[PDB]
Design a binder for this molecule. Structure first.
Ligand code: CA
Ligand code: CA
Length: 269
């Protein structure tokens, strides 16, 4: 039996599924610790930018979990992604420890723009800016990539980098009560929020796990962007971004939630 994690229903993905919008033909790069082979995922390819870890398999668990929120297959097992037919690419920029350099991240962004990705999902935020990171976010954007980045988990009233850059769509996290998760960074530049607490998804070892963080919120938005792209193949990254913000569910404070809660079914109708 397939279960639908609460965040998946919270964003109204199933209603878009019923209308035929599944992410078909949309290319999504997961910039994270890698993605492990799993019965509920279909990995199309990828690259590793982590010295010493040449494989795109996941040695941490984070990248596999993020991937599942985006595109766990719609079938009789496991979970269900926002965009179950999306074309998933594993872009390993974080080593098994869960950390990486500004230069491996930057190389992963360049990779996405150079290989025609439509969406790039970045889970890690840094407290300090990086001219290298900023260049990479701009380059991917000009090559038509929608860069979706986590706001960060410090609980502070300002957002991490690269989420803070103008060309990155910054995503915070809500809890099951639609309130701001305690750790979710907010403030200037926050574009939207999605579920980030108690998120069940795919995990190495052909299993499932629940994790918390802004990196769990991010894939919900990347997945929603893939449904919009499928519905509107001629739209640009900027059109998609603006349409997601415009169809988001207002939660109140723009400081805490930006445009509000992503709504996959309102964005894709
Ligand atoms: Ca499944
Ligand atoms: Ca931003």
């Amino acid at each position: 039996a397939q279960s639908v994690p609460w965040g998946i229903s919270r964003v109204q993905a199933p209603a878009a599924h019923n209308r035929g919008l599944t992410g078909s033909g949309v290319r999504v790069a997961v910039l994270d610790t890698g993605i492990s082979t799993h019965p509920d995922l279909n990995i199309r390819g990828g690259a590793s930018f982590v010295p010493g870890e040449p494989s795109t398999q996941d040695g941490n668990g984070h990248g596999t979990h993020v991937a599942g929120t985006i595109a766990a297959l719609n079938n009789s097992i496991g979970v269900l992604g926002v965009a179950p037919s999306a074309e998933l690419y594993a872009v390993k920029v974080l080593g098994a420890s869960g950390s990486g350099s500004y230069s491996s991240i930057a190389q992963g962004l360049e990779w996405a723009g150079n290989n025609g990705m439509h969406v790039a999902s970045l889970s890690l935020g840094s407290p300090s800016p990086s001219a290298t990171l900023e260049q990479a976010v701009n380059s991917a954007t000009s090559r038509g990539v929608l860069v979706v980045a986590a706001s960060g988990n410090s609980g502070a009233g300002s957002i991490s980098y690269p989420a803070r850059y103008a060309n990155a769509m910054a995503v915070g996290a809500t809890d099951q009560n639609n309130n701001r998760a305690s750790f979710s960074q907010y403030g200037a530049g926050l574009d939207i929020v999605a579920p980030g607490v108690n998120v069940q998804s795919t995990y190495p070892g052909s299993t499932y796990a629940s994790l918390n963080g802004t990196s769990m919120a991010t894939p919900h938005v990347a997945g929603a962007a893939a449904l919009v792209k499928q519905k509107n193949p001629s739209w640009s990254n900027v059109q998609i971004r603006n349409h997601l913000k415009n169809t988001a569910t207002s939660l109140g404070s723009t400081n805490l939630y930006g445009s509000g809660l992503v709504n996959a079914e309102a964005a894709a109708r």
